[PDB]
Amino acid sequence: EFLKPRLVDIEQVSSTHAKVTLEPLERGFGHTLGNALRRILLSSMPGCAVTEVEIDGVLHEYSTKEGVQEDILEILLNLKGLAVRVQGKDEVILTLNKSGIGPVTAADITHDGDVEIVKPQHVICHLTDENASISMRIKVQRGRGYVPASTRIRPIGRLLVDACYSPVERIAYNVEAARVEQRTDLDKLVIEMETNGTIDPEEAIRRAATILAEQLEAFVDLR
Amino acid sequence: SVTEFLKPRLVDIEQVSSTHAKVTLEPLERGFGHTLGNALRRILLSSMPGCAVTEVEIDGVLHEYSTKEGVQEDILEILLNLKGLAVRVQGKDEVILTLNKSGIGPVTAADITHDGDVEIVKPQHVICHLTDENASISMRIKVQRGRGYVPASTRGRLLVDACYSPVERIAYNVEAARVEQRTDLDKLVIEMETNGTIDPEEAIRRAATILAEQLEAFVD
Amino acid sequence: KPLVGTGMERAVAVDSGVTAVAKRGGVVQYVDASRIVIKVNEDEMYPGEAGIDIYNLTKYTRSNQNTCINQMPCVSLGEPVERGDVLADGPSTDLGELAL
Amino acid sequence: ILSPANGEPIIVPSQDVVLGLYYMTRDCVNAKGEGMVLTGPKEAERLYR
Amino acid sequence: EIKELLKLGDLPTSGQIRLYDGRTGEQFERPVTVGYMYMLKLNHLVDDKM
Secondary structure (H helix, E strand, O other), X not given: OXXXXXEEEEXXXXXXXXXXXXXXXXXXXXXXXXXXXXXXXXXXXXXXXXXXXXXXXXXXXXXXXXXXXXXXXXXXXXXXXXXXXEOOOOEEEEEEEEEOOEEEEHHHEOOOOOEEEOOOOOEEEEEOOOOOEEEEEEEEEEEEOEEOHXXXXXXXXXXXXXXXXXXXXXXXXXXXXXXXXXXXXXXXXXXXXXXXXXXXXXXXXXXHHHHHHHHHXXXXXXX | OOOOOOOOOXXXXXXXXXXXXXXXXXXXXXXXXXXXXXXXXXXXXXXXXXXXXXXXXXXXXXXXXXXXXXEOOOHHHHHHHHHOOOEEEXXXXXXXXXXXXXXXXXXXXXXXXXXXXXXXXXXXXXXXXXXXXXXXXXXXXXXEEEEOEEOHHHOOOEEOOEEOOOEEEEEEEEEEEOOOOOOOEEEEEEEEEEOOOOOHHHHHHHHXXXXXXXXXXXXX | OOOOOOOOHHHHHHHHOOOEEOOOOEEEEEEEOXXXXXXXXXXXXXXXXXXXXXXXXXXOEEOXXXXXXXXXXXXXXXXXXXXXXXXXXXXXXXXOEEOO | OEOOOXXXXXXXXXXXXXXXXXXXXXXXXXXXXXXXXXXXXXXXXXXXX | OHXXXXXXXXXXXXXXXXXXXOXXXXXXXXXXXXXXXXXXXXXXXXXXXX
């Protein structure tokens, strides 16, 4: 008796910005699904985040490295913003080796078949000396939510990075009148999502709907 | 472990009355209490199918603001009583019920002439109060099946606000809940009152079923 | 930096002495998180000197209230600098502006 | 709950609670839903929500 | 001048915008003053005081 929605369009505005159209929707269902999906997308989407760094010759973040523009703290903060999509495993170790003057960016990370750098232009640090060289081992783990390093339950030199696993950055939804075959009371939901580029928008929508359905399974047979 | 979420271990149903329930689910993921509570609340308020009185025709009464001899209440109060009349129409999407009564006494829903498919949830619901032994009230009540709440302002036939949804009241509260170490979890308490057509548990199950079936295209 | 300021932020940041201020103009010959080396312009060098200004930056030292005093450079390699220019930001300072 | 100095209540709501009750109990001349007739407070809450 | 600068950025001159409740998605009934304030963390941390 209810007209169920369909995924009808996915407008990839940019690599990290997309719009997903759900149609048709009954009265009231547009806002209900909009808010439910917005909350689930903002809180529950899994992603890959940098969790551990090992820079050669570095003992702690509160130190400098000769020939490097940034402090170790700022390098770690830059690595925290590194957006990576890992395929086929929940944990990977990337290697970064660079020498000579120039910006050390995400494109300089040693290529791995199962790892993809969505934004190669992400600057990690800057080498300012001809003889300066930087070598680091970056641990990337899969997770969801926000896991601070302080709350995580190791030799000296392994620097813990706060993990913000969520790939979703901004969620907006709009409910607009959708021209139905005959009916004029149906609507459509346009969900605009801005991410870090590591999640497929259709994958995100299906993941959020699956989470909502699994959470509803308790209510569907109440006891 | 990124695909698995917490499920309610404890589900407690407290029957405050025959039509009043308090359902508690604990624990939920952080923020999931508000999500589920608001979604179910919206569906129960605005989407639940049900049968309700939409129109009435009273002999001798030709407008909303009019008087009828022999009845203690005003026509507005008779319409207010008719609004609360819970009815289950199994057979059809639309029926007409005839209320014919005379003599001193409380004219209730039991006095309605019986039709097999139509079932009056509570017969003692007082439609009005006849005060004169020669006072007679005879009216035709249009019962229609719809969704949620449809005010008569959006629509001598006297219009009645259509309370199709069997939900008389729905509210939810989110409290703190904890497992062994995690203490930022959600506890969802749903306080719900129906009109007696369906018990609150069944209505909650129906709302959850509607919401879950809305997602069929997207669930893995 | 404060989006809404009064214009006094630069004066406070410079006069507090928490920043590295260019004694003489020149070009950034070398820069790293701990040090800045300025190649002084020919019109500002005295006779018989190399004309090199070296600024060693304070790195992660406690203050009187156990807060962190850290100077980080705000200039890049090869940048031209003028006398009175901020070379390294101090604590609560953003490009020579007080940033509380 | 009462004050020992004068006997007046001392748990009286202030600020946000007073503002919320005042706003919810204020009336408007042509607010949406004016002129309706309701079976009770539950119907009013359903209409508002 | 502030309202002129708001016009230049295609923002309302009143400095108040429509906000939605994250918990429910419902519109707050009145416009809310939304802007940017420069906030400071004072040296009065609860870690040092508890």
